[PDB]
Design a protein around this ligand. Structure first.
Ligand SMILES: *C/C=C(C)/C=C/C=C(C)/C=C/C1=C(C)CCCC1(C)C
Ligand SMILES: *C/C=C(C)/C=C/C=C(C)/C=C/C1=C(C)CCCC1(C)C
Ligand SMILES: *C/C=C(C)/C=C/C=C(C)/C=C/C1=C(C)CCCC1(C)C
Ligand SMILES: *C/C=C(C)/C=C/C=C(C)/C=C/C1=C(C)CCCC1(C)C
Ligand SMILES: *C/C=C(C)/C=C/C=C(C)/C=C/C1=C(C)CCCC1(C)C
Ligand SMILES: CCCCCCCCCCCCCCCCCCCC
Ligand SMILES: CCCCCCCCCCCCCCCCCCCC
Ligand SMILES: CCCCCCCCCCCCCCCCCCCC
Ligand SMILES: CCCCCCCCCCCCCCCCCCCC
Ligand SMILES: CCCCCCCCCCCCCCCCCCCC
Ligand SMILES: CCCCCCCCCCCCCCCCCCCC
Ligand SMILES: CCCCCCCCCCCCCCCCCCCC
Ligand SMILES: CCCCCCCCCCCCCCCCCCCC
Ligand SMILES: CCCCCCCCCCCCCCCCCCCC
Lengths: 260, 260, 260, 260, 260
């Protein structure tokens, strides 16, 4: 069949207000996350500096994405009466997220692995698989949702949703395997935290698919608003929550080593 | 009933001048506040680094908000004779404040708690309540004032004003409780300062509601000007004044620990 | 009576060239001043860090003001034949200075006081008076010159010129008093420098009123050009000259303390 | 003969989506590369600081280029029905790469040489030849592909392709010679890595010519998309991959010296 | 007589391509120069920190100038057939250089003097003369070439060319005198380098007048292209070459002092 695309829906003034607030709120929160990261980079040892590097990368990429989306949103809808009618630049209010996720879902994997205990081939092989898996999960989603069928084709969405979902599972398994192998070799406290971090990351990765279902199934202004609110909030929660948790695991691990 | 929205009023050239000066002055003052924060971050110990992190976050978010509002203001009113007539981008001269406050009212709570003495569950429980309470105070206000009724509906303003005000009290009580519990465990000097900081923060949070009353009751260019001047000044005073006070408390506390 | 405002005059191509060069030259010089400040912030002791903080603030605010004025100037005049005719954005080529001065005339006062010897109430009371006096000197000027009468009313200019001038004297007296009290307690060398710094600051503050007289008395393109050249040069000289002098005093004072 | 230029092709909405994603993804990845570089610059000794300087330069230049290309791309095609028709600014979506490569192909040469063992005239003479050779390889390509014939002339492309290719070989030989001379004087581990780095750099420099062949031979929207995807990916891989490898070599060399 | 100004010539697409590449290449190279400067500021002692300050200033000012010229160039010519016709904002593609040179020709003088041996009045008197001389050399050139006669008057160009040239000689003599006095008091190695630096700076200052001769004598698109290429290259060579040389002298002098 053929659903309308999420960036083709005219927005009521309320919906144009909500959609701006969450775009601006997310970009603001990610910029605070960047500043927190830089001000507290000294608390973590050089062994776990990959965490600092990843967290910074996630925040820098995500902050720019959300700046571009606020500017695209400002120039992507035109007021025509009581409604904001999408322009041609309206696709640049939702499509930039996939650019951000492409860099940030791989880095979140690397940031999780950084606190976990892995060495040699096992380390390298895990990282590459997790990066590769995560990137494809996102790129295949981008093809289905934006590129192929112009995001108006239900058939396309489903095929690439499935493909996307396969690469999710591949990627999830790899990260879950590695953490489980790494939990025994950690102090109880660390291993407790790293079990929580893994659950939080995987639970966060579960929300985003929901917003792809909206696109396959529902279509309208409220649904465009709901896709923004859902995805914006998920970013704020996952990117700020999980990255904080990993720094706690990494600060703890830093000290444990100093003890020894 | 139905009042006109604050961003729907045509401004006299005087009012368009005043409104710019205070938008630019506030953004300038907040940028100095950011630079002060970075140049003097070494005076505080790692125990109270949360203060540095919060203060930076408040200043970065607020500086961007006020940059966007000056640019929106520049492109949001069109001169038509002797008056500046608002465009559709004029709502982006007042609505960005709620994005800023959403991140900065929670952080001001965290910054106050950072100098106060609290630990364990009590700490976590207090912080989350204060963050959650503060965010809702702001978001409910944003719904009433901008999203619901397009900020033209007196009925909506009142309902969400009330709701907003409930979450204010919840949030205030939590912060006031915690400081009162924390005052005994501090040196007289510190506790003196932290009593002042609490009064200043709560007194500052009392001014902003005033500007919501203007919107419910009065409507016109002078009132749009008065809402900007009021809110801009309150930001400059609270954000620069209170954040300075907390660094003084945090610097003092840092030293006290050193002499122990 | 009535005079045309300084931003209502059509400019000859020569005058549009000169006026750009000095706007860009001043903003460039202030940006170098910022970089000098950051590269040489280590030469000053923590006792006089309120000089580094002030100097940075002056430079950051002034650099943004002059960026906005170059961009406003680029978009504020339209070429119509042989002359550049001012738009409605032309007022944003002169009005941003008052935003800059509002933050920078108070900070220059604080920066002077930082090297001088003041303690306790005397210190606090002096600083607040100097900040408050300096801000009102600028804001009252802004009312007379831009806000009240649209800067076309000779009567308004004179009233607020006078008011402005009252607050100048108040502010000057306070700063001059404090330095005179502080000169005896300093080493001869320092006190020599601090006497020069005070003269330079007060002499610099004398030039700016000249450009308000042009507005009261003369009107035309040559006069708009002369108001830019005068004010731009005064900024470059005062902001870069005086701030350098204070760092010399502050560096000297830092050493004196070390040798004790 | 004559071919349409790569920036003269109308793009399908899919192709306009793909082409944006890879422009934004590359600029995001290069910005992460910059942040990684600055967070990990302490791991390298002052002997090999040239590496840090080069890597930073590569990333700063490349990040700006790709920002300009995303903004040019946003303003360089106009939607006309089902297709995006190139404007006059469309040439600024492909031409900025040559500006980036002009600075970054020379620096990649310098970064390779920095870890290798070379001294005195031999060092200076090698660097200058490699810089000069690399710059001409790029500039001659820019003449053929953009400046001469407006990138529509097959004859021009071939002449400058050849010239370009001559300077490639000159440059390659010089870098390959120097590394071969340098491999014996390095520790086995280092020399292993530096052999890989040389292969990776030269292999990366082999991909870019492919995109020049497309231009000579094929012409159309899919080919414009294929030139972006090819060149964007090559940048991400070479700039992030090779620069990482050199830091590994540089970190290793740093330690080896510490041992001694 | 009368000649067309350099920014009044319509450019062929080739010439519009070349002129962009060199504007973007110069701005990119100056930004790398800034990053090099910051990454290697630790190699020089506090005695010669003026060098670091100058070099940074030169690079910051020049990088902004060339950003504002690439953006002016993008918005200063309109495609009209096969040619790019200059608009009104085309003078802002050549006039910003004089703003840059006004700050950077004085600083280059200060940077040369920083590594040379001068003290007391001789130092102060030399610096002020060199700064003053250099600024007037540039400003008088700006009057002749841009402001007076709109850069269309051969008579004006010649008068101010001559005046400009007088201040060049004054400035050159002062710098050459001081270096000659300073060469004896330096180690042979340092003095060798400082002799080269002086030749390089004065030789660089000789090229720029050539581009003023083009304007007096020749007029056309090729000549506009030749003025950009000449001036852009001269900036890249002088600003990056000379500033590097001075850091070498300054690093050497730093060490010499350490070994004493
Ligand atoms: C900071 C942003 C994060 C953590 C983003 C995560 C996004 C995903 C895990 C997306 C997953 C998807 C599927 C597995 C199926 C449908 C398409 C996607 C891309 C939304
Ligand atoms: C830096 C900005 C600060 C401290 C902002 C504070 C804002 C408030 C405390 C706002 C309170 C409100 C109410 C309790 C009722 C009406 C709606 C609000 C949001 C203005
Ligand atoms: C960095 C900028 C500085 C030091 C600006 C100083 C400006 C003044 C001292 C302005 C004084 C004025 C009067 C006392 C009367 C007329 C109005 C003013 C504001 C120009
Ligand atoms: C970071 C970017 C890099 C490493 C770019 C490298 C580009 C080249 C080695 C380009 C080579 C070319 C030829 C030898 C043939 C003609 C076309 C060129 C310029 C693409
Ligand atoms: C970084 C830029 C530099 C070193 C610029 C130097 C420019 C000059 C030395 C200009 C000299 C000129 C004359 C002496 C004659 C007339 C033309 C001028 C103004 C370009
Ligand atoms: C390397 C990335 C390649 C992506 C290919 C996507 C092709 C989509 C074609 C859409 C046609 C309608
Ligand atoms: C009409 C207003 C639409 C609001 C949509 C809210 C979506 C909430 C998702 C969680
Ligand atoms: C987080 C979820 C936000 C939901 C906001 C709902 C607003 C509804 C507005 C209805 C307008 C008619
Ligand atoms: C607080 C700042 C208040 C400024 C008041 C200025 C009033 C101007 C009135 C203009 C009337 C015409
Ligand atoms: C202070 C000097 C002001 C000079 C102004 C020159 C104006 C020229 C007009 C053609
Ligand atoms: C550094 C000098 C570069 C000169 C390039 C010359 C290109 C000539 C183009 C001619 C077009 C017809
Ligand atoms: C490797 C590059 C592949 C590019 C494919 C682009 C297809 C565009 C859709 C037609
Ligand atoms: C510092 C003051 C600079 C003044 C420059 C004066 C230039 C006057 C040019 C007049 C042009 C008339 C056509
Ligand atoms: C300094 C060399 C200048 C070369 C200019 C080339 C102009 C090309 C016009 C076609």
């Amino acid at each position: 069949d053929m659903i309308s695309a999420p960036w083709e829906a005219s927005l009521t003034q309320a919906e144009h207000s909500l959609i701006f607030y969450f775009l601006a709120l997310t970009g603001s929160a990610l910029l605070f996350g960047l500043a927190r990261t830089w001000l507290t980079r000294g608390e973590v040892g050089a062994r776990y500096r990959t965490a600092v590097v990843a967290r910074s990368g996630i925040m820098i990429v995500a902050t720019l994405s959300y700046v571009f989306m606020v500017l695209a949103f400002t120039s992507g809808y035109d007021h025509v009466g009581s409604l904001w009618v999408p322009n041609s630049e309206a696709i640049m209010t939702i499509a930039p997220r996939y650019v951000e996720w492409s860099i940030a879902v791989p880095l979140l994997s690397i940031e999780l692995l950084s606190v976990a205990t892995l060495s040699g081939v096992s380390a390298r092989r895990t990282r590459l698989a997790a990066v590769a898996g995560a990137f494809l999960m996102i790129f295949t989603g981008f093809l289905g949702a934006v590129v192929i069928g112009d995001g108006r084709s239900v058939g396309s969405l489903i095929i690439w949703g499935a493909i996307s979902t396969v690469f999710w599972i591949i990627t999830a398994v790899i990260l879950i395997r590695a953490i489980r192998h790494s939990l025994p070799q950690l102090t109880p406290e660390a291993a407790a935290l790293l079990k929580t971090a893994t659950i939080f990351l995987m639970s966060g990765w579960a929300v985003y698919p929901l917003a792809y279902l909206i696109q396959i199934l529902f279509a309208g202004g409220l649904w465009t608003t709901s896709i923004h609110i859902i995805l914006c909030t998920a970013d704020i929660v996952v990117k700020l929550g999980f990255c904080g948790l990993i720094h706690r695991i990494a600060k703890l691990r830093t000290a444990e080593d100093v003890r020894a």
